[PDB]
């Protein structure tokens, strides 16, 4: 129960009378109850790395012994909540303390125990029914958007002996009671899970469904899959805000978990100011994405343990909402800062410095964290299937992808959306460079595309090859100029420009292409590639004649068609329904076919 | 309030460098302050570096020279280092540990604040927004500082970063289209530069705003460690309680890092990267991040840490972690310094992430962003044209190239080149920028929207 | 097939014993049950990193890049459990798959693995990016038992000469590419053009291969000969005239 502080040197506190303590357990040191992690044991002397500043912690101070490791506290109240990396509810600490600082050793519960929740038990469950870990034994109306399914913890099972009637309950109320081998377990609406322990699932299915974002470049050229693993460069003008906002507002992800993991103070202030104001249209009503989002936000002056465990807290919350049956999108703002916190912990423990000073396990930690992303058959009786898509961003030193953190992240992840400050300056938004980006889920999504969007795969391959050919010809243009380019080279260049400026380029502020449905995206790409193929066919088949066609001839004859191709962006998905947009694109293709037939 | 009498111990078990290891201590407190009397009566202060069992390792601020067992007494004050803070310490010169060195009285506390402070709540911090004008054109019209930003100055040994710091202290203020204050902390600053700072602030009539903490190079390095915390505790008191916009200028974070390295070695911690502590990132974050706007309070703390990049290596741990924690950089160029331009601020490698929040209508003016962007573009093009002229010759250059060279010369002679005592309001800075932009015709100013060119280009 | 699995989320130290479990099973199946066992140890980089973690915890003497001073001996305990044995008709063939950190063949893991094992098959990022499958770079690849596994009797008698000549011509083609990056096309002599054509056709017809295409050794040697025939006999200096006369003309 109670230890005592036998010594204090920096953040390391050696506690006596700690015979029963467990390795990597959590302890409240001092009279202010500073959080601390047992990092060593020697007889009764347990060494503790104290998260908060140890100034004023005097010998003889009691050391309360929490019977758990660093464990997130799951249950209603997560949604719309701003936590620290340690699950400290900043938004509740500020309200209760009426201060701009975080009091040393603040012990505010992660989830409010006073707020009441409308809880409806599973109708089938009774007294005596067999229940198993992962079973949804109730549903709580947390929001008009997210129904929080209260479910049994893993490692728990038995026969229900009391299930509460529908009503208003708090996180401290006992909503269920079960028995196994005579041992009786009373379960409230809140459970606790170690952050560093993977939440079990009945099976980890392959990722076979897109994580649509609405950005044409991301959805079409470089698709990510629900349960995917993605990386994003972190720079000043890169534009990661567009990716975060798209995933938060328009993506099919049922839940969003944004982990700052040690950002600058003002950067985190910007995130905390912007995310609450973002709104999404669900069921015709403009709700707030914070009805379904949670923010594990912490700055660079927070406890290093909090910064290093922010990623684990975020992934554990994402896994919880996945098991609930949802599709969650976790977004680490900069895993580089988490890796810096990890290196700092290694230095504090005086562990051997591995490659470029990072710990001897950086790759293992990153791989194990990214392994928690995926699509699973959620554990429990109600057949569910959730997912956790990690979009953790990394910060390459000066644009170099060779540092240990970026190298490990690129090796582990399967998508890299490669935002570019160069394109940001050129005003090509989104700034995805579409040359260093990549996606390894194309072979996984082949089945989905063939079922729903049959032609999209050849369209995307042709677009990618067009862009590659344009990149290769960019050098030839310098050597011999544009006048020396063949007609096929000219058509490739002038459709590559069309794709760059009119397909990849997309403005998130306009009401018509802030969110681009995949049907619209594939329609635009199909029209562009049809133009390219038919122009190339005309050029090749008139190369043999004296009246050979040229790109100049085609442009002069069909300036209207090129204008319409450029204006395909301006079709509003909302006002111009799917049927209307598809019909208009089909009419456009008819016009192109008529014009090309007349010209040829 | 602590009413119990302080305990004085003559139980000195051993002395090792700066450490007096006392024994038989009654419930030793970590970070406790302890005043020790030497055999001959000399009084020194110290901090309980490490606590174990009944022992207490007391790092003595001054050296251990002359300390002995069996005669040296040590009275444990019973509390961690708490500083007395008030508004009246605005217009005072204190040493590293807070003792006045202006022949004034000791601070009559309005409060007793712990120097280590607590981390400002991220949910209570607010985006800095408006601009703090430093009077220097090269960092007003090109690297403006927002109210709440942390923007360091990078420089090397010998460059005039301390002179720039004193100029910023003398000239800093709100845009003004008595709620502003400056907290100058100087660490590891030789007697000459300390006297320069003190006398300059006293003479130029700005001392009414400036609280000056001086830690001379030969003063205790533990005092150097606690100097920035004293300065930022005073800044937090003045900003988040007295509600006045505070600019904290911390000089020689490299010297602070040297003091931190010394304290780590005294603690017997193994050197980390490049011989520095592994937690130096956390320490620098603890210092810097005590800044910014907050919710429900009208004050703020802008920070301008000044670094001496050792060997002019931007990859050195101190500047690297400072760039990781802060939100910009103002580079002091040895090339410009040798060319005798003052301030020798390079605007190409410099940056201020929150310039867009610092500038704009109602904060500085409508055309600030466009003028700054066009000035940067023209300056880069001018450097490129100079490089090209170095190869092709003056004749081979075109009229646009000659215009760019002319703008480069006049931009380094009128915009950058300022003079130590030339206080330019941001409006004067923008007027100079427009004088330089009017070298070119309206067409080559492609980065200034026509809406702004039609209004500000004429005349 | 017998699978021992230790995924990323599984315990780190258990990777220190997974290879030994697999190799003990292989040894039982080969030297006691007389099977021919192909042992495949995937992510020997992960195994070595787990070993480094344990060594760091023990504060053992570190080698290059922090790995324990005995990493060579440990990797040898793993790898040297291969090969045939007298009086027993079994065998254990090992194909560890290890990821070179930062594509650095001089990183301690690949370096010590090359020192211990009897060769290496070098998968090339440049070839993979160019979309050449398998992206194998024969120049840094090596096989220490080819010299005896090829020749007359086993496979064909021109095998060694063809392999050596392909190595030499491929290396000279790479050198010609490097010089061409500097001096441009117009400064290349006819021999350099011959070598560049050989390099192109070698990477397109010899290295490049279907993922399910099973070329016999004779087919591979025939491809090698049709590639070597680019040069005149006098430019093939590795192959003795006796071999060239018999095999070149066809």
């Amino acid at each position: 129960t109670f230890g005592y502080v036998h010594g204090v040197s920096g953040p390391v506190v050696t506690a006596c009378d700690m015979a029963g303590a467990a390795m990597y357990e959590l302890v409240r040191v001092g009279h202010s109850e500073l959080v601390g992690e047992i990092i060593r044991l020697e007889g009764d002397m347990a060494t503790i790395q104290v998260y908060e500043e140890t100034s004023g912690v005097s010998v003889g101070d009691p050391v309360l012994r929490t019977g758990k490791p660093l464990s997130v506290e799951l249950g209603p109240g997560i949604m719309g909540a701003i936590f620290d990396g340690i699950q400290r509810p900043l938004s509740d600490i500020s309200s209760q303390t009426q201060s701009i600082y975080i009091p040393r050793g603040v012990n505010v519960s992660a989830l409010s125990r006073d707020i009441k929740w409308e809880f409806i038990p599973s109708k089938n469950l009774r007294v005596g029914s067999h229940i198993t870990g992962g079973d949804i034994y109730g549903i709580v109306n947390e929001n008009s958007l997210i129904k929080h399914k209260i479910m049994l913890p893993p490692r728990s099972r038995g026969s229900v002996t009391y299930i509460a009637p529908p009503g208003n309950y708090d996180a401290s109320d006992v909503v269920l009671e079960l028995e196994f081998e005579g041992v009786k377990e009373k379960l409230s609406m809140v459970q606790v899970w170690p952050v560093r322990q993977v939440r079990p699932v009945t099976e980890k299915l392959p990722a076979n469904h897109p994580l649509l974002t609405g950005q044409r470049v991301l959805d079409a050229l470089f698709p990510c899959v629900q349960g995917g693993t993605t990386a994003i460069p972190g720079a000043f003008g890169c534009g990661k805000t567009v990716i975060s906002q798209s995933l938060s507002k328009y993506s099919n992800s049922d839940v969003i978990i944004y982990v700052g993991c040690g950002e600058r103070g003002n950067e985190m202030s910007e995130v905390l100011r912007d995310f609450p104001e973002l709104t999404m249209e669900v069921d015709g009503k403009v709700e707030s994405i914070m009805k379904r989002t949670a923010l594990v936000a912490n700055t660079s002056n927070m406890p290093v343990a909090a910064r290093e465990a922010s990623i684990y807290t975020g992934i554990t919350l994402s896994e919880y909402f996945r098991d609930m049956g949802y599709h969650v999108s976790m977004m680490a703002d900069s895993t580089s800062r988490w890796a810096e916190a990890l290196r700092e912990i290694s230095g504090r423990l005086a562990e051997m410095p591995a490659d470029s000073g990072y710990p001897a396990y950086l790759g293992a930690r990153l791989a194990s964290f990214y392994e928690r992303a995926g699509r699973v058959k959620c554990l429990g009786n109600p057949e569910r299937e959730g997912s956790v898509s990690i979009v953790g961003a990394v910060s390459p030193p000066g644009g170099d992808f060779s540092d240990p953190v970026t190298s490990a992240t690129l090796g582990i992840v399967q998508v890299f959306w490669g935002l570019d400050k160069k394109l940001a300056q050129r005003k090509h938004f989104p700034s995805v460079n579409w040359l260093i980006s990549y996606s390894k889920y194309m072979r996984a999504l082949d089945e989905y595309y063939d079922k729903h969007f049959t032609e999209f795969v050849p369209l995307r391959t042709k677009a990618k090859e067009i862009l590659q050919e344009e990149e290769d010809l960019a050098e030839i243009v310098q050597l011999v100029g544009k006048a020396s380019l063949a007609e096929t080279d000219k058509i490739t260049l002038e459709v590559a420009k069309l794709i760059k400026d009119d397909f990849l380029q997309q403005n998130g502020y306009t009401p018509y292409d802030r969110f681009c449905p995949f049907y619209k995206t594939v329609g635009m790409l199909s029209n562009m590639i049809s133009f390219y193929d038919m122009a190339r066919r005309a050029v090749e088949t008139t190369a043999q004649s004296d009246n050979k066609i040229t790109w100049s001839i085609i442009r002069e004859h069909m300036g209207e068609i090129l204008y319409k191709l450029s204006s395909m962006k301006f079709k509003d998905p909302v006002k111009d329904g799917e049927a209307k947009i598809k019909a208009d694109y089909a009419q456009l293709l008819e016009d192109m076919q008529n014009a090309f037939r007349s010209l040829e | 309030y602590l009413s119990q009498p302080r305990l004085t111990y003559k139980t000195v078990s051993g002395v090792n460098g700066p450490l007096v290891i006392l024994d038989h201590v009654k419930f030793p407190r970590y970070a406790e302050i302890v005043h020790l009397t030497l055999p001959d009566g000399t009084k020194r202060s110290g901090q309980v570096l490490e606590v174990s069992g009944s022992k207490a390792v007391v790092q003595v601020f001054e050296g251990t020279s002359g300390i002995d067992a069996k005669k040296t007494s040590c009275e444990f004050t019973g509390d961690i280092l708490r500083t007395p803070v008030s508004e009246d310490m605005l217009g005072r010169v204190f040493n590293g540990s807070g003792k006045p060195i202006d022949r004034g009285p000791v601070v009559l506390a309005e409060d007793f604040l712990d120097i280590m402070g607590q981390p400002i709540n991220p949910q209570c911090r607010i985006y800095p927004e408006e601009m703090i004008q430093t009077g220097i054109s090269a960092i007003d019209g090109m690297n403006s500082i927002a109210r709440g930003q942390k923007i360091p100055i990078f420089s090397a040994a010998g460059l005039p970063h301390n002179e720039i710091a004193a100029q910023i202290c003398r000239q800093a203020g709100l845009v003004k289209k008595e709620n502003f204050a400056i907290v100058f902390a100087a660490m590891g600053v030789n007697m000459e530069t300390a006297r320069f700072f003190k006398s300059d602030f006293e003479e130029n009539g700005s001392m009414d705003n400036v609280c000056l903490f001086l830690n001379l190079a030969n003063d205790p390095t533990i005092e150097r460690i606690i100097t920035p915390r004293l300065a930022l505790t005073t800044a937090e008191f003045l900003a988040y309680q007295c509600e006045k916009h505070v600019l904290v200028i911390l000089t020689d974070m490299s010297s602070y890092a040297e003091a931190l390295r010394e304290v780590s070695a005294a603690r017997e911690e193994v050197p980390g990267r490049r011989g520095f502590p592994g937690y130096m990132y956390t320490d620098l974050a603890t210092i810097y991040e005590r800044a910014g706007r907050v919710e429900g309070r009208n004050g703020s703390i802008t920070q301008i840490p000044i670094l001496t990049m050792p060997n002019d290596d931007i990859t050195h741990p101190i500047p690297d972690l400072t760039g990781y924690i802060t939100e910009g950089q103002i580079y002091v160029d040895r090339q410009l310094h040798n060319r005798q331009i003052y301030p020798p601020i390079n605007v190409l490698p410099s940056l201020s992430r929150l310039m867009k929040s610092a500038i704009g209508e109602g904060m500085t003016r409508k055309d600030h962003a466009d003028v700054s962007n066009q000035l940067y573009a023209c300056y880069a093009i001018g450097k490129d044209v100079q490089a090209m002229k170095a190869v092709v010759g003056e004749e081979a250059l075109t009229s646009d190239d000659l215009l760019y060279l002319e703008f480069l010369q006049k931009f380094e002679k009128n915009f950058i080149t300022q003079g130590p005592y030339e206080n330019r309001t941001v409006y004067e800075t923008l007027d100079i920028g427009w004088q330089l932009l009017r070298i070119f015709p309206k067409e080559m100013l492609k980065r200034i929207p026509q809406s702004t060119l039609s209004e500000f280009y004429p005349r | 097939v017998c699978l021992f699995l230790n995924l990323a989320n599984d315990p780190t130290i258990e990777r220190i014993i997974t290879p030994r479990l697999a190799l003990t099973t292989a040894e039982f199946l080969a030297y006691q049950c007389e099977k021919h066992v192909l042992v495949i140890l995937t992510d020997m980089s992960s195994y070595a990193e787990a070993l480094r973690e344990v060594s760091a915890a023990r504060e053992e003497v570190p080698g290059r890049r922090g790995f324990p001073g005995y990493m060579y001996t440990d990797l040898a305990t793993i790898y040297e459990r291969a090969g045939r044995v007298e009086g027993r008709n079994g065998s254990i063939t090992q194909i560890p798959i290890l990821t070179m950190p930062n594509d650095d063949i001089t990183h301690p893991i690949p370096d010590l693995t090359g020192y211990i094992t009897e060769g290496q098959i070098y998968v090339d990022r440049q070839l993979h990016n160019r979309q050449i499958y398998p992206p194998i770079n024969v120049l840094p690849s090596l096989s220490r038992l080819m010299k005896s596994a090829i020749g007359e009797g086993m496979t064909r008698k021109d095998h060694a000469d063809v392999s050596n000549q392909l190595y030499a011509c491929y290396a000279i083609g790479k050198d010609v590419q490097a010089m061409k990056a500097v001096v441009g096309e117009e400064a290349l002599t006819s021999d350099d053009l011959l070598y560049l054509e050989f390099l192109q056709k070698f990477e397109k017809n010899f290295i490049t291969q279907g993922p399910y295409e099973n070329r016999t050794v004779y087919e591979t040697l025939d491809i090698g000969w049709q590639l070597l025939r680019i040069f005149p006999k006098e430019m093939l200096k590795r192959i003795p005239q006796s071999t060239l006369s018999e095999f070149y003309p066809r």
Binding site: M352 | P271 | E59
Partner: peptide
């Protein structure tokens, strides 16, 4: 770093021996 860590470990062992 390895040398300094080894020296620190030896110093700790020697202190224990003296105690």
């Amino acid at each position: 770093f390895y040398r300094l860590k080894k020296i620190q470990e030896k110093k700790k062992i020697i202190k224990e021996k003296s105690e």
